[PDB]
Amino acid sequence: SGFRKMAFPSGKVESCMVQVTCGTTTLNGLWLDDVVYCPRHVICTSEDMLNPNYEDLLIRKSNHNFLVQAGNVQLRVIGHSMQNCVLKLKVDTANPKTPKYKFVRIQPGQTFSVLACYNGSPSGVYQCAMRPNFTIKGSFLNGSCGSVGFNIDYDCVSFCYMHHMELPTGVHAGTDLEGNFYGPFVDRQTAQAAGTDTTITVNVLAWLYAAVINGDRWFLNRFTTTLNDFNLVAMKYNYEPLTQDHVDILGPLSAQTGIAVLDMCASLKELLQNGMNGRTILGSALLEDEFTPFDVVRQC
Amino acid sequence: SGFRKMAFPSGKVESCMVQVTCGTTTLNGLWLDDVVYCPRHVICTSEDMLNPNYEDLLIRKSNHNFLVQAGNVQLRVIGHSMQNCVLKLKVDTANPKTPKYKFVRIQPGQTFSVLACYNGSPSGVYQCAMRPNFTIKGSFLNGSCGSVGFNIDYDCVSFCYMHHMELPTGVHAGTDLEGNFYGPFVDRQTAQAAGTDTTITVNVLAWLYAAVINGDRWFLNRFTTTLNDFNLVAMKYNYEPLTQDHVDILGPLSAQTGIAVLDMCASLKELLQNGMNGRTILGSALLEDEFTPFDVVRQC
């Protein structure tokens, strides 16, 4: 029992983390087989960032302009290419600790583990959700660019995020591992800002099921609402619409607890309309939306 | 920027985790050099647990009664001994991935990372605090006994916890790695229950400094209180007393922010007396007490 924000064990990813330096900029890279992946803005000067043409900037670079360090061993770069907003640095040594891996892009609402790194060295691991506005609320300091986000399934690491920048509100933006940004953000200096965000309704419901599984039942009621009438209340409170697919995904948790999804929705409606009246749910005084149905099943 | 409950990278510990079976009971063990550490209750039957004499139960066991699995390789047990509430199983193979390590006992109020494991396989990692009542609010299911808690300093893993049991309130109790329980709990079946708990004041203050460092300033005020008068309010709200040592430990965070500790205490007094009036601090609607001053410095 108990319920915690839980990351995947990070060992398989720690073994892929390297240091990448170009000019005076140092950041993190991901070493898989004979390729190191890092943010392409590693090749930029502070003045390049105002309006960079990365095609031009990369033509002016050579393999020897990239210094790659894997622990103490230096990795010889024998080629380089750009793939959208990431750089691919071919190196002369395949990573002997390359796990089985995939590059997968995730959906707003899904979660992943972040291995925060500095100078190629792992510093900590925590769980994040892709917000509906395609930002993540991470914990990143200067030098963390190139840190990656991932999930593990069986023995296979599914990489889904690499970190590129902090937006003015303190939230974070990055790309998938094919170099394509999540959301309408760019790796250049603009006034770009996070758009308005919404609460991930299906996750809040999943977490309410986690609470019931853990003996937190005070918010339950005998009422049941319809999908339509729930969604009228959701919109008012800046919650995402709930679909029948969401109801189906919550199926197993509904069965394990014996509480129908639309019954839980009536509880969520009441919580939204009245607050918690000084009580807590799974140790929180607000409605948590960064646990997916899978996260709850995996931990309960 | 940003602030998250962050665990240490777990790779060094994952490489030490093994499966230990005795009779029909399977749980987790920690493999360091040629020794595997696990909860001694692995040798018990459900009926032994009602009133076990572990001295008797262990005399009746042989090395071949213990089956130790490290991934696919079976580890031959060549000796066994009891050390308080842990078993030490000598095996014929030193763990080639043994990190630099120490066994340290922690203090209530300090934090550590938990690597939850099942059948010797790591499942997730999360941060915990040792509560003042010597329980931890973990996330543990059947089979998690033997999972360990740890901190990392430089390259050295300091093991501080191994998991033994769940108490009736759903909180968790275990030992240090010398087998000595945290708190007044025993590895036998009784009506034992967690005692009354208190809030870790110095940590709440640390987390308020983290919030200021991250731009959350709405709870600040121009007032300053005395240590004595703060502690009269702390007691009323079930907070631990604040000592001058606590003030000194908060020194660096005070200097980084320019807010004196006793100035912050006046903010905490107000928050305790009035609540948050529907606002949040670092994404929480309640006062968080599971981040130490070190945790804040490390992440900010």
B223 phi/psi in degrees, rounded to 5? -80, 160
Resolution in A: 1.8
On whether the CB atoms of residues B159 and B102 are closer than 8 A, the answer is yes
B81: Cβ contacts below 8 Å, ≥ 6 apart: B87, B88, B90
Instruction: Tell me which residues of chain B, numbers 91 to 120, contact chain A at a CB-CB cutoff of 8 Å.
Output: 115-116
3 state DSSP class of B235: helix
DSSP state of B123: E
Could you give the angle at which helices A261-274 and A201-213 cross, rounded to 10 degrees?
100
Instruction: Determine contact: A14 vs chain B, CB below 8 A.
Output: yes
The tokens describing A200, both together, are 């991930």
| Angstrom distance (rounded) from CA A293 to CA A251 | 10
* CB-CB neighbours of A2 under 10 Å: 22
On whether the CB atoms of residues A41 and A166 are closer than 8 A, the answer is no
Q: What is the 3-state secondary structure (H, E, C) of chain A?
A: CCCCCCECCCHHHHCCEEEEEECCEEEEEEEECCEEEEEHHHHCCCCHHHCCCHHHHHHCCCHHHEEEEECCEEECEEEEEEECCEEEEEECCCCCCCCCEEECCCCCCCEEEEEEEECCEEEEEEEEECCCCCCECCCCCCCCCCCEEEEEECCEEEEEEEEEEECCCCCEEEECCCCCECCCCCCCCCCCCCCCCCECHHHHHHHHHHHHHCCCCCCCCCCCCCHHHHHHHHHHCCECCCCHHHHHHCHHHHHHHCCCHHHHHHHHHHHHHHCCCCCCECCECCCCCCCCHHHHHHHC
Instruction: Determine contact: A146 vs chain B, CB below 8 A.
Output: no
Phi-psi region of B215 (alpha: psi -120 to 50; beta: other; left: phi over 0): left
**Chain A residues near residue B125 by CB distance under 8 angstroms:** 6-10, 125
| Angstrom distance (rounded) from CA A267 to CA A160 | 34
The tokens describing B170, both together, are 């759903």
| Angstrom distance (rounded) from CA B244 to CA B242 | 7
Instruction: Determine contact: A258 vs chain B, CB below 8 A.
Output: no
CA-based diameter of chain B, in Å?
69
Domain B11-91 fold is: Thrombin, subunit H (2.40.10)
Could you give the angle at which helices B261-274 and B201-213 cross, rounded to 10 degrees?
100
Q: How was this structure determined?
A: X-ray
Give the CB-side neighbour count of residue A229, counting CA atoms within 13 A.
Answer: 10
A106: Cβ contacts below 8 Å, ≥ 6 apart: A112, A130, A160, A161, A176
Give the CB-side neighbour count of residue B8, counting CA atoms within 13 A.
Answer: 24
| Angstrom distance (rounded) from CA A173 to CA A117 | 16
Q: Among A3, A6, A112, which would you mutate to test the B interface (most chain B Cβ atoms within 10 Å of its Cβ)?
A: A6
B209 phi/psi in degrees, rounded to 5? -60, -40
* Interchain proximity A124–B284, CB inside 8 Å: no
The tokens describing B124, both together, are 């997730």
Q: How far is A126 from chain B (nearest CA, A)?
A: 5
A202 phi/psi in degrees, rounded to 5? -60, -35
In one-letter notation, the amino acid at residue B207 is W
Cα→Cα distances B278→A118, A237, A240, Å: 36, 15, 22
The tokens describing B51, both together, are 């009133």
A-to-B residue pairs, Cβ atoms closer than 8 angstroms: 115
On whether the CB atoms of residues B27 and B20 are closer than 8 A, the answer is yes
Instruction: Tell me which residues of chain B, numbers 201 to 240, contact chain A at a CB-CB cutoff of 8 Å.
Output: 214-215
The tokens describing A131, both together, are 């917000």
A163 phi/psi in degrees, rounded to 5? -80, 130
Q: Among A125, A213, A290, which would you mutate to test the B interface (most chain B Cβ atoms within 10 Å of its Cβ)?
A: A125
**Chain A residues near residue B8 by CB distance under 8 angstroms:** 124-125
The closest of B139, B202, B64, B125 to A10, measured between CA atoms, is B125
- B201-300, superfamily in CATH? main proteinase (3clpro) structure, domain 3 (1.10.1840.10)
* Interchain proximity B126–A10, CB inside 8 Å: no
